[PDB]
Amino acid sequence: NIEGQAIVYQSKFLTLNGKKYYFDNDSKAVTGWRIINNEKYYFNPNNAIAAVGLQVIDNNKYYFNPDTAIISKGWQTVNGSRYYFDTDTAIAFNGYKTIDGKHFYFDSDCVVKIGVFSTSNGFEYFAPANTYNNNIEGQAIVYQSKFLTLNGKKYYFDNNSKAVTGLQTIDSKKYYFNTNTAEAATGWQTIDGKKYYFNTNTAEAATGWQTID
Numbered sequence: 001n002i003e004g005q006a007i008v009y010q011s012k013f014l015t016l017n018g019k020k021y022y023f024d025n026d027s028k029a030v031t032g033w034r035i036i037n038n039e040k041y042y043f044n045p046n047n048a049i050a051a052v053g054l055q056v057i058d059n060n061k062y063y064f065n066p067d068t069a070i071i072s073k074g075w076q077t078v079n080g081s082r083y084y085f086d087t088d089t090a091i092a093f094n095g096y097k098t099i100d101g102k103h104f105y106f107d108s109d110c111v112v113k114i115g116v117f118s119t120s121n122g123f124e125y126f127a128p129a130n131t132y133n134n135n136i137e138g139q140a141i142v143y144q145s146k147f148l149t150l151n152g153k154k155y156y157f158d159n160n161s162k163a164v165t166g167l168q169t170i171d172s173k174k175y176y177f178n179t180n181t182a183e184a185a186t187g188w189q190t191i192d193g194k195k196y197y198f199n200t201n202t203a204e205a206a207t208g209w210q211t212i213d
Contacts, residue, residue: 020050020069040071040090053078061092061110075136082112082137096120103140112138115150116163116182123163123182153183154203173204 001007006027014021014029021029022041029048034041042051042064050069055062063076063085073085084104085092092110096103096119105113105126114137116125125148129137140161147156156175158164165177176185176196184203189196196205197212 021048022050041069042071062090063092083110084112102136104136104138105140114138116155118180118182121162123165124161125157125163153186155183175203176205 008027009023010025010027011023014023022034022036022043024030029043031043031045031048034043042055042057042062043049044051051062051064052066052069053064055064061083063072063078063083064070065072071090073087073090076083076085083092084097084099084106093099093104093106094108094110096105096117103119103121103124103126105117105119107113113126114128116123124140125143126138127135127141127143129135132139132141135141142161143157144161145157145159147154154175155163155177156168156170163177163182165179165182167174167176169175174196176189176191176198177183178185185191185196185198186200186203187198189198197210198205
């Protein structure tokens with residue numbers, strides 16, 4: 001053609017300066033969600049450029065593969081964070097999920113969660129990678145009746161693979177846990193109108209002629 005003439009261009013992927021464009025049977029680039037060869041492509045309404053990474057449409061999160069612009073489903077690790085997506089709709093999950101019978105938990109931000117959280121069953125632990133002999137980072141485990149310490153705070157389990165929150169003294173040492181935080185209290189605590197003091201490094205109630213400062 002002459003330079004700048006809008007020529008006919010149909011049914012092929014156009015790559016221009018690293019971007020991606022798709023044209024219909026006519027000579028116009030397409031916008032919005034598009035299906036070619038069952039791949040679930042997406043294009044911007046004001047640029048017609050395919051997506052690169054995480055792209056929230058209105059409220060649902062998404063992931064698109066860089067250098068190919070095809071959507072990806074399943075466990076996708078982007079920017080040093082773990083994500084999981086749907087198979088039918090490819091939406092990142094929010095909340096505790098029953099996928100594969102392992103009770104994965106997610107936040108409103110779709111990064112994976114590590115620690116103990118208040119679930120529907122109660123307070124169930126979620127473990128990092130390579131703690132259990134075959135575990136996914138963020139998968140609930142069969143941890144039973146052992147003391148666990150993550151970033152200073154401590155709490156104790158039971159035989160039902162759950163986190164307890166009562167007083168429940170063990171070997172004449174009381175380990176009070178919070179009713180919602182489910183962590184052991186440290187320092188001064190005025191519970192039920194009475195005074196109890198637990199230690200800093202450990203979390204038992206000191207008894208006897210115990211002197212503070």
